[PDB]
Amino acid sequence: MKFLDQEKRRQLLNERHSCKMFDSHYEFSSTELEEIAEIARLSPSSYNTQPWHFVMVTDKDLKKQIAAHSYFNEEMIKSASALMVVCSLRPSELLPMQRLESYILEQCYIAVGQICMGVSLMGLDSCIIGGFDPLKVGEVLEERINKPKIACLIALGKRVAEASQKSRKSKVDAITWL
Amino acid sequence: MKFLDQEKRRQLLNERHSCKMFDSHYEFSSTELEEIAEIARLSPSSYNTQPWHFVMVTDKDLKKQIAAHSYFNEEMIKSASALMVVCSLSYILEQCYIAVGQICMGVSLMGLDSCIIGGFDPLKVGEVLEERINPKIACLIALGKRVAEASQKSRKSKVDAITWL
Ligand SMILES: Cc1cc2nc3c(=O)[nH]c(=O)nc-3n(C[C@H](O)[C@H](O)[C@H](O)COP(=O)(O)O)c2cc1C
Ligand SMILES: Cc1cc2nc3c(=O)[nH]c(=O)nc-3n(C[C@H](O)[C@H](O)[C@H](O)COP(=O)(O)O)c2cc1C
């Protein structure tokens, strides 16, 4: 019951890459945005806690304000069709270095791994972003939504340039066979 | 262009499910084993740090041992074709979980099945392995072939999960 053959499954692993620049002229349809939200939502988590909230930022000025405080990621964020803000839930909403906080981030990180695979399946591109001023991006999103704890960002869109070459430590360093 | 069309992308997200029991007859080829390991290795991380190590358990006797300490996951793990032990070497040491999500998606693309496992005793699971590896064990992933259909998706509302800006 496979979906893609070896050649295709291998290509996807390479197409899943950190897209450093996006086609600013490519706009996300409601269909594209909705499926991405479903890829995020349908992700797995321990005891199905789903301690995440995904904020889809498509407004250019609002994304631009976040971009201005993402340092070297500014032009990239600006270029992107959409910017996902992966928010971690409060521990008070979870229950009916901090242990609960780290647990929640672990679930959020899983979702991220699923999302970026989904984005490649559609034919689009992403870049996970942790290089940003956390206090400042919260600031410009405060009046819009309650002050969130941000795990990471995910820039989204269509690429202008080809995928960068994969650089990973040796199969030996990463894999033990038993 | 697309790798898969709309229907098949939507189908996959349901095929990507926590498989509770596996075909205890089915055995992983080397080719199946090697892809699963490469999906894991090509995962993304901060500054390409790759703060992880993946241990592939296939031997039925050693897997049987790990399953004995896996509480309510005992039969599942014994019946699986393989068992991956995911280990970590801001905060960056949690980013092995980014791999986890990529792996399970890649596994389902092959038309196989997986279950992410957090229900185990890390003391005794680490003990039976420590004659070889130096941990830190984050979680487990059972890998193999299903015996029945994928479970129904239960999730909180789209409204609970998504803010549209
Ligand atoms: C970190 C982690 C640990 C998990 N541990 C277990 C487990 O010990 N036992 C189990 O039955 N399921 C476990 N699961 C599976 C979740 O219960 C499952 O992801 C959730 O119910 C969503 O359903 P789905 O994966 O079938 O789509 C775990 C999932 C994650 C992400
Ligand atoms: C938590 C996290 C944060 C990241 N932040 C950035 C970033 O701020 N800027 C950037 O260009 N890439 C960022 N990346 C992408 C990684 O640098 C990239 O995944 C790694 O170099 C491997 O390359 P690849 O994904 O293209 O295979 C981030 C990745 C992760 C997991």
UniProtKB/Swiss-Prot annotation, chain B:
Key words, A-Z: Antibiotic resistance, NADP, Oxidoreductase
Positions that bind NADP(+): 106-111
GO biological process: response to antibiotic
GO terms, molecular function: oxidoreductase activity
Impact reported for residue 19 to Y: Loss of function and acquisition of resistance to metronidazole
Residues forming coiled coils: none
Effect of residue 14 to K: In strain: ATCC 43504 / NCTC 11637 / JCM 7653 / RPH 13487; resistant to metronidazole
Superkingdom of the organism of origin: Bacteria
Keyword check for Oxidoreductase: yes
Effect of residue 138 to V: In strain: ATCC 49503 / 60190
Assigned EC number: 1.-.-.-
Effect of residue 49 to K: Loss of function and acquisition of resistance to metronidazole
One of the Pfam families matching this protein, by short name: Nitroreductase
Family per record: Belongs to the nitroreductase family.
Function summary: Reduction of a variety of nitroaromatic compounds using NADPH as source of reducing equivalents; two electrons are transferred. Capable of reducing metronidazole; inactive RdxA renders the bacterium resistant to this compound. The reduction of metronidazole generates hydroxylamine, a potent mutagen and bactericide.
The name this protein goes by in its record: Oxygen-insensitive NADPH nitroreductase
Gene name of the encoded protein: rdxA
